[PDB]
Amino acid sequence: GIDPFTGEAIAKFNFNGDTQVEMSFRKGERITLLRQVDENWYEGRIPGTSRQGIFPITYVDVIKRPL
């Protein structure tokens, strides 16, 4: 995201979020990484949209980690 403390990732694969906290996306989307919340999950959002939530790290190519 524009805040340099946030990170950036590109989705490698489609991700369907099954629960209300998850954020679905398709392969190729750019995602702002807000925080790595455990060994397998990020919290993130897609700027320009209201889309926000958690997703698994295995679905994205992390370009820049949050600070």
β-bridge mates for residue 52, sequence order: 45
20 three-state secondary structure: coil
Q: What angle do CA 54, 11, 7 make, to 5 degrees?
A: 65
The CA distances from residue 56 to 33, 48, 61, in Å, are 12, 21, 11
CA pseudo-torsion sign 10, 16, 18, 24: positive
Q: Please list the alpha-helical segments (H only) found in the chain.
A: none
The radius of gyration computed from the CA coordinates of the chain, to the nearest angstrom, equals: 10
Extract the tokens encoding 39: 């060994």
β-bridge mates for residue 54, sequence order: 22, 43
Residue 40 class from Cβ within 10 Å (0-12 exposed, 13-18 middle, 19+ buried)?
exposed
Q: Please list the alpha-helical segments (H only) found in 2-65.
A: none
Extract the tokens encoding 53: 């939530």
Please state which of the four CATH numbers 2.30.30.40, 3.40.50.620, 2.60.40.10, 1.20.1050.10 is assigned to the domain occupying 1-67: 2.30.30.40
58 three-state secondary structure: helix
